[model samples]
Target: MEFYEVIKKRKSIKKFEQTAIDRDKLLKIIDMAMRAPSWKNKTPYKFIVVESDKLKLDIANAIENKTSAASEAVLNSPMTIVAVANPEESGDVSGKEIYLIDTAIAMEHIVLGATDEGYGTCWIAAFNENKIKEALKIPDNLRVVALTPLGVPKDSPKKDMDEYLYIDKWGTSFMESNV
Candidate 1:
């Protein structure tokens, strides 16, 4: 898919088919995602790819979502990517954190790459981080930024932006400038 089309195709898929994605395709997406720019050139992000049925269900059980749809999605999907970031390896403000910003950028790359290759992903961030760590055996110092169930999308995403998109007059876009 073209770069433009990939961005268009990328969306938060709420559910997915149980089909197992090719491992090679998964590596391709992760490789492309690693190209995301980072703080001081240090990406500071870790991705834990989970495929075991028991583990997925374990993590899902630990999560407390308003709907069982998300937990079921994890249990039903063939795979999930746990996006973790090392705050100690990245930048920070007075009290604000920056590791998640880097991790989000990288994760979006994976999401778009997956979309380009005909897979779907929905960013799941509302889970209990400690529970995830316990389930995945993640270290205490690391942050579980988010996770996503990856598989063949059951349906296409909604096309319309929810009305907040606009030209904010922040400045001239790169399209109007020279490198």
Candidate 2:
């Protein structure tokens, strides 16, 4: 499959098999993830690879939610990569926090790399950051942005490319042309 095809095929897998992810694959994925562009090359993002069964269980147990399946996914998956960043390491332009955007880009790279490596991943954001920080023993200066459950997928559904993309104005259709 081509790059675009692989990207389109990637889905937010919820169910995963009880399998181990190769550490080497993870390193390679990180290699790609760190290459993401950042504000003045100040890549503020830091990641935590939760591979221990006990730690995963503890972190999952910390969350208090009955409706979200992310806790369950985190509990079951063999790996959970938690993305964190130092907001001070970035700048704010017109109230747009650059650290969050920078961190998100790096994390997205990780997700894409995981997909190409034949692993399933779910970009999870709904969770108790305070508890997770406590669970991971993270510092007060860093903020948890997102996390993901990674492993062999149980399944992926058929998705369609039906996004509404516009050009210069809203409701205006996008047109590809040479300048």
Candidate 3:
């Protein structure tokens, strides 16, 4: 898919088919996602790809909301990518941490790359981070920023953007023409 198409097609898929992703395709997506710009080129993010069913179930159970779409997605999908970052490896600007920002950008790259590769993903952030860290045996130094389940989407086509989209000025609707 074209870059524009990939961006437009990338949406949060709450459910997915239990289809395994090809190793090469997954690697290709990771390779492309690594190109995301980082803080002072520190590249503090690392991905933990989970495919074991038992592990996935544990990770899903780590979420406080057991019935949440993200939890179910994690349990049902064939794979999930746990996005983790090291804050000390990246510096802050004006007291604002950049490691979180860097990880988010990289995760988006993975999402778009997955979209381009015809897979589905949902950025699941609302979870018990410490629980997940324990479930995955992640080091204390690395924070779990986010995770996403990768599989074939079972949901409907991407919905239209909601009313929250804005233009140059905040609260100014982008749906209307001001040009």
Candidate 4:
């Protein structure tokens, strides 16, 4: 699929089919995420794939009603990718903020890749990091940037681009020429 089409079609899927994702496609998505730009070329991102039923249930329970959409997605999907950022390894103390941005960009790449592959993804950042770290055995130095569940979409939600599009400034009318 074309880049623009993938971007436009991508949505935060809250429900998923019962099908499981293939290993090759999962690896490809991760590789695409790794290609995202990082600060000074210091890639400080780490990804953990949660596939075990026990672990997935633990994660679902950890966030449960607190993050309704995320919890539901996690419970329904076959796997969840936990995105993390290591600030110390990224070699940018003052620019550590970029680490999160870099991770997010990489994650979006994965989301887009999923869309292109006829899969679905939902970017979730409302979970408790401490609980996730404990459940996933993540090191203390790495911060959980975000979590996204990957699967086949049971339903795709429609979005109106006009609701978010703007021209030069916020709330300004957007023109095709300006865009």
Best by TM-score: 3
Instruction: List candidate 2 stretches off by more than 4 Å.
Output: 62-66, 155-179
lDDT of each: 0.73, 0.73, 0.76, 0.73
Point out where model 4 deviates above 4 Å: 64-67, 91-96, 156-179
Give the per-residue lDDT digits (tens) of candidate 2, residues 17-132. 98888866877777777677887877776677776677677667765566557778887888888887888877686799998999899999889999988888988776677777
Tens-digit lDDT string for candidate 1 (94-157): 6667787788898888888999889988878888888788777777888888888889988642
Q: Is candidate 1 or candidate 2 better by lDDT?
A: 1
| Model 4 C-alpha lDDT per residue in residues 42-107, reported as the tens digit of each score | 666766677767777777777735547788789889888777677676555564577777888988
Candidate 4 lDDT trough over 10 residues, lowest sum: 164-173
TM-score of each: 0.82, 0.81, 0.83, 0.80
Candidate with the greatest lDDT versus the true structure: 3
lDDT of 3 by residue, 1-179 (tens): 89898989889897888777886687777876667787776677777777768878888888765467888889888888887778888668888889889989988988999999999998887787887777777777778888889999985622122232222222333345341
* RMSD values, in order shown: 13.3, 14.3, 14.5, 14.3
lDDT of 3 at 117: 95
In Å, residue 17's CA in model 2 sits off its true spot by 1.1
Candidate 2 whole-model C-alpha lDDT, 0 to 1: 0.73
